[PDB]
Amino acid sequence: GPKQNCEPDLMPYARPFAVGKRTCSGIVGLPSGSDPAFSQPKSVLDAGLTCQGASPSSVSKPILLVPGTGTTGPQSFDSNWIPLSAQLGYTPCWISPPPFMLNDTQVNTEYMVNAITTLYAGSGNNKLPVLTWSQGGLVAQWGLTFFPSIRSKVDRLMAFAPDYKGTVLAAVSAPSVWQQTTGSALTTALRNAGGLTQIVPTTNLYSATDEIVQPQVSNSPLDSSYLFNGKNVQAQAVCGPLFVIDHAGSLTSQFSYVVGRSALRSTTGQARSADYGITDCNPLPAND
Amino acid sequence: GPKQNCEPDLMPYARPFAVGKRTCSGIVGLPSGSDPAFSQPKSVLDAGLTCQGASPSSVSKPILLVPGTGTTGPQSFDSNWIPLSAQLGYTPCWISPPPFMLNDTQVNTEYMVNAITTLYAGSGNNKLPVLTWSQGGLVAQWGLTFFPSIRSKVDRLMAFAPDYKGTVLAAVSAPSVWQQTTGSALTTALRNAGGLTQIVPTTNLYSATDEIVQPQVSNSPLDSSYLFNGKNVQAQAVCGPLFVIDHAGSLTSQFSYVVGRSALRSTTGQARSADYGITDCNPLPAND
Numbered sequence A, B: 001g002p003k004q005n006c007e008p009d010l011m012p013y014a015r016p017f018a019v020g021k022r023t024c025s026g027i028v029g030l031p032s033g034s035d036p037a038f039s040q041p042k043s044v045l046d047a048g049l050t051c052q053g054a055s056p057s058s059v060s061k062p063i064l065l066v067p068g069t070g071t072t073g074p075q076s077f078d079s080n081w082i083p084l085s086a087q088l089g090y091t092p093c094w095i096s097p098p099p100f101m102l103n104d105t106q107v108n109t110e111y112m113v114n115a116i117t118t119l120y121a122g123s124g125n126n127k128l129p130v131l132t133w134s135q136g137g138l139v140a141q142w143g144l145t146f147f148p149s150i151r152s153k154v155d156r157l158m159a160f161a162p163d164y165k166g167t168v169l170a171a172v173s174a175p176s177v178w179q180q181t182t183g184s185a186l187t188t189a190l191r192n193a194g195g196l197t198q199i200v201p202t203t204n205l206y207s208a209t210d211e212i213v214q215p216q217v218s219n220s221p222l223d224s225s226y227l228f229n230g231k232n233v234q235a236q237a238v239c240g241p242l243f244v245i246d247h248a249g250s251l252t253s254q255f256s257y258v259v260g261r262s263a264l265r266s267t268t269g270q271a272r273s274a275d276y277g278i279t280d281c282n283p284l285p286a287n288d
C-alpha cells in the first residue's frame, strides 16, 4: 500500500475542470491558451466603447464601467460612478453592448474584452480597474475566465450586485435574461470552469434585500454575489437588518461609494474593513 | 427588447462546461474528440486484464468487472459476481490495476478503457456490460466521461456502492484514497465535466448504512452514488430502515443480486422496479 501527502496531479485532459483545487504540484490554475475569436467585427465592438472627454486609444487613468441588464453605460452610471470616478481622478469609460445588455452575455463579454485590450494600450500599457453593476460583474468574470489575455490587464474588479450564480427571482425573455436565470447553461459553465473563485483582486458589494438578484441573504458562499478569496461585502453584515438598500442602491448608496472608493485606492486591490464602519451605513445616494 | 423561448447556445470554448444543460440547439452533449493518450504501455495495461476460461481477445458474452479500492478483481468478485455472472451466461472478466487499486484513479481508468476496447473487439465488436464496486464505478464513469471511444462499446453500467462524489468518511494516504475524498480535485473534475449525469444506461445500488462511502442517506441527488437519469436504488428506500447492508453487502447481498440481474437482462439497460420487491430484501449473500 503506497502512501503520499498530496493528491495526484490531474492529467491535462482533466485539469480545466478542477481550477482552484490543490494537487501535488500546487493549486490548479486557469487554462492560459489563446483568446477565443470574437463573433463580432472589432469595429462593431469599438462602437460600443466610450470615454468621457477622451478617446479610448489615448486616455489617462481609465476606469471601465460595465452596465447592468436592460441599460446602457450612461443609464447605469450617469448619476453615480461616471461623476464619482471622475472626482477620484479617473477618466470614466464604459461599454454599452446593444441592445441594452439584453443580448447574449457571451457577446456582451466581447465588448468588455475588446475594451480592456483597447484601454490597456490606450493608457500606456497600464492595468486598469473594472467597476460593474449586475450582469456587468458576470460579464467581467466570464471574460477573465475565458479570455486569458486580459487577466494581466485588469488590476482589480469592484462589482456591485454581481449575479455570478444568476438569480432565482423569475416566459419568452431576452437572451441575457435566460442566461442569468439560476440553473442556466451559462451560469453552470462559469462555475464549472472555476469562475466562482476570484481571478483578479475582487470586491463584491451586495444586499440581502436585492429585489432582482437572489439568493443574497446568507452572507456566505451560497450568495449569488460571492467569490472565493474575494472581499465579499453583504451590506447587512456590516450595517444590520434595518439597512435595506435595493438592487440599484447597491450601486449608488453612500455606503457603496465608501466601499468602492476603498477598493479603488487599496494597495491590495480589495476594499478594506478598516475603511468603513457603521457611520458609512448611509442608504442615501453618494452623488447627492 | 428582444425575446426568445430558449437560452442562447454556448460558444465552443464554454460548452464542455455545461454538459447536460439545455440551450436552443438542445441538450449539450459531452465533447467527442480523440481519446487522451495512455501513460502506461498497452502491454502493461493488458497484463491487468483477465477472463475466466478465455482470452480477452476471443471471448463470448464478456462482462467486465471493476474492483473496489484496496482489492484485485478476484478479491472483490471471487465469492460473488464472478460465479454469479457465469451462471447468468457471461464470461466473467476483470481488471486488477496495481497495486490493489491504490494508485492514481486516472491510471486505473486506463486499465478499464483498454479492457473495454479489447473485449469489444474480442467479442466480435459487440457492446458489453460493465459491473463495478466502490471506486470501480468512479473509474467507469471517469472513463466514459473522458474517453469518447468507449461510450459506444459499453451497453450498460451496473454499479454497486459507487462513490462518484467520493466519501466524507476520513494523514498520508494512497493516491486513490486522496482522490476519493470528497472535495478532491478528481471528484471536482468529474462533476464539472458533466460526469454526475449517466452516459450509458446505469443502475446504482447503494446503502444508507455504507460504512465506507457517505453521504448515502437521503435517497436523492445528494447521495454519492446518485447519477442524474440513472436508476438510483438506495436499498432502504425499498426495504425500510431495518435493512442495513454494509459497503460489501451492497455488492454481495441477495437483494443486490436481484437488482443486478434485473439490470443485466433489462432491454432498457437499467434495473426495473417490477423485478424486485419486499421479498428480495434479503441481506444474506446471494452466492450462498
Ligand SMILES: CC(=O)N[C@@H]1[C@@H](O)[C@H](O)[C@@H](CO)O[C@H]1O
Pocket: A098, A099, A102, A103, B002
Ligand atoms: C441590436 C442588436 O445587436 N441586435 C441583435 C441582432 O443583430 C441579432 O440578430 C440577435 C441575435 O444574434 O440579437 C439581437 O439583439
Ligand SMILES: CC(=O)N[C@@H]1[C@@H](O)[C@H](O)[C@@H](CO)O[C@H]1O
Pocket: A217, A218, A219, A220, A222
Ligand atoms: C438555503 C441555505 O442553506 N442558506 C441559508 C439561507 O436560506 C438563510 O436565509 C441564511 C440566513 O442568514 O442562512 C443560509 O445558510
Ligand SMILES: CC(=O)N[C@@H]1[C@@H](O)[C@H](O)[C@@H](CO)O[C@H]1O
Pocket: A002, B098, B099, B102, B103
Ligand atoms: C505497482 C505499481 O504500479 N506501483 C506504482 C509505481 O510504479 C509508481 O511509481 C507510483 C506512482 O506512479 O505508484 C505506484 O503504486
Ligand SMILES: CC(=O)N[C@@H]1[C@@H](O)[C@H](O)[C@@H](CO)O[C@H]1O
Pocket: B217, B218, B219, B220, B222
Ligand atoms: C444535508 C442534506 O440536506 N441532506 C439531507 C440528509 O442530511 C438527511 O439525513 C436526509 C434524510 O433522509 O435528507 C437529506 O435531504
